């Protein structure tokens, strides 16, 4: 009676956002230090889960 499951999962690595999705939650949500370029605005190449 002890059975098992087989669930399969999907993770996208390097997609890119559409035109009406490149925005921010606020003007100052996640801002790096002054005198440094934004590391976030580079295209993504990683994942974390």
Partner 1 sequence: GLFQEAYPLTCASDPALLRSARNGEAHARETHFAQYLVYDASPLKGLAL
Give the residues lining the site for a second copy (CB under 8 A): 19-20, 22-33, 36, 38-41, 46
12: partner contacted, choices partner 1, a second copy, none (Cβ within 5-8 A by kind): partner 1
Q: Which residues 9-38 are close enough to bind partner 1 by CB under 8 A?
A: 9-12, 15-17, 20-25, 29-30, 32-33, 38
SS3 category, 20: helix
User: For residue 16, what are the contacts with CB-CB under 8 A and spacing of at least 6?
Assistant: 43, 44
Q: Do the beta carbons of residue 40 and residue 13 sit within 8 Å?
A: no
Decide: is 4 part of the binding site for partner 1 (CB under 8 A).
no
């Amino acid at each position: 009676l002890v059975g098992a499951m087989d669930l399969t999962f999907v993770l996208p690595l390097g997609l890119f956002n559409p035109v009406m999705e490149r925005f921010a939650a606020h003007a100052g949500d996640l801002v790096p230090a002054p005198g440094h370029p934004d590391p976030r605005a580079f295209p993504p190449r990683q994942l974390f889960f």
